[PDB]
Design a binder for these strands. Sequence first.
RNA 1: UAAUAGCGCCGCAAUUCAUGCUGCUUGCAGCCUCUGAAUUUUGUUAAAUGAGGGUUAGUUUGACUGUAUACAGUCUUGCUUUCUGACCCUGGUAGCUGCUCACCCUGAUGCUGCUGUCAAUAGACAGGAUAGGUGCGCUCCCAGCAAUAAGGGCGCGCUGUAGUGGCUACUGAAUCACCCCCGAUCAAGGGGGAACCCGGGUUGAAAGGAGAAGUCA
DNA 2: GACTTCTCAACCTCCTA
DNA 3: TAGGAGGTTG
Length: 437
Amino acid sequence: NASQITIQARLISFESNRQQLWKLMADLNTPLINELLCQLGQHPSTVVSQLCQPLKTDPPSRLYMSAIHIVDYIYKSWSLPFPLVFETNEDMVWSKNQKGRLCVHFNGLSDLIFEVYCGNRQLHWFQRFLEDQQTKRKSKNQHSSGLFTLRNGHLVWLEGEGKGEPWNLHHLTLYCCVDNRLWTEEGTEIVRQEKADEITKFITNMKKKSDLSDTQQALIQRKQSTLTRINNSFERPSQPLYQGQSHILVGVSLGLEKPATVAVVDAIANKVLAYRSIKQLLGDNYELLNRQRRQQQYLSHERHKAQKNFSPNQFGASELGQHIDRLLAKAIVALARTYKAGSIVLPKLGDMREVVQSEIQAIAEQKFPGYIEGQQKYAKQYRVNVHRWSYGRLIQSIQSKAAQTGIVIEEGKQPIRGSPHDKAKELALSAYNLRLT
RNA sequence: UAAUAGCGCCGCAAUUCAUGCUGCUUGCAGCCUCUGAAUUUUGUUAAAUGAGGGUUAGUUUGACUGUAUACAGUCUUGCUUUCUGACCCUGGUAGCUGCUCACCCUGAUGCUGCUGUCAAUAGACAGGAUAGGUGCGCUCCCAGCAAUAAGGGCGCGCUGUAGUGGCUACUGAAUCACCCCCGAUCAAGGGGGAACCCGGGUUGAAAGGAGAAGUCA
DNA sequence: GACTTCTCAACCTCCTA
DNA sequence: TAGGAGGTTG
């Protein structure tokens, strides 16, 4: 699931409650470090479960389980404590304070009621969590847990500049992972379909082998309980999702001179419905692209100047590149949705060094026809000014936005040469040609 | 005193276009009114970019419902970012750390560069982001430096007190989004104005997917 | 900071209120 | 009886 998103909010409680939480978070981060050395040594994560059992009594029943999950994630990789991650829809017990504000009541923290401070841009998510738990409560456990839009969340701390306090210094911040497709009823239908198929496959696979007479029956019981409860739905808003025209393919072309260009082209026909260039996708946000290029030049010169012995290089850095890589994805997806596009085509990220090198060469021979010295000099001067874009965050942001809206993404092969509009059109057509296979 | 030239950018002009407009003939035909694209050629334009360091639980970007992408209704919380304004500053004082250096010569993706006044010492003091060059920046150029790229020479294995940096602690100013006043700042809002529009509104906007750990750049 | 992997329960099952 | 906290699992 690439459609799922993460929301955040700041929690606000008394000084005493924060004190208890800080003490427990320290008493939980201290032993999980000890669990690491024990865990890592034996391998050269199922055994980890009974590995923590002796560690239980050494120094929050649901919270000791939490540290187990974090380690498993680190292993498979190959004064703030670590976040307390809640890998359960039902770990948090939402409520509404007497003053109307929401509250969170964590499972292991019986007396720790935090007040939820968030933004109105995303208060509807917390209200949805509340309504979901309330709907389960009204139905008396007759709704499957797969559909409360709240997959998991982890509580983190944050740094402050007061420099005078153990926790008054630090700010709580809740990070709930919420499946965006789980908001509308029609999307929850597809989510229910996929989850039912997964449950069927998993139960068939597990029935095909033999397990313990009690754990196997209990897990299978939960499976059919989920299958029974999942058919009863919630009173969620209805939206017609997205239709998608198969023949219409929005082709997106990445380069150096133009950071990104698009081409809405028919595939059954051979006509381009409408091109858009980088100056036209970024409506009134083009000065942002220019100043980001200037900043990426300045920061690269500074990084080169710093050489080997340096102070931290984030001086003057920002997330302007990310803001532009999101403004661009929003515009590209909106353009796709306007023309009923069924898919957005993106270049393979692997072919993004060869493409930029070839584009630099093409510009060089375009300026200096055969004067090789001038071509090399201009290539150097161009690489000085027009730095390489960040073609990873852009492809990722488009993948997120399109998946959220409902537009599937395919990948083709960007042509080596030609005008950026022609490159985009031919990429889009090549994608359809390969889809025909 | 000098900044030629070069490259990126930004507009301003032309020209050809269509990603545009109109016409139906529905894919052709005109054109350039708009919206843009592509060349090349300009820098007057109060034309458009750009313009040191900071300052808001800042405004807008919102949800659902009914109707037809709009409007009406209801709810709304201050999270993380990005711009634009506006404002403030160009800092103390007290410790500590890092680097560099006998001298020349080359002069680096090196350093520094604003006004005014006083001295005309090398610095103060008042202003202050229009801050060396050009419409705007640069790893380019220019002026001074250059021991703090690199290399070359060359005194007695040293030349070492200065030049630059970093850090902590307590501090200074602005704690803002029409303006002021009193608050809050693990929360908390209230009060008083003014302009504009028609007792109500307005008095800038945007975007969010997080975390972990590696691989590096 | 910017690129690369990786994660995104759930009904059961007691046990106090 | 309805939450609260644990419990377990490919």
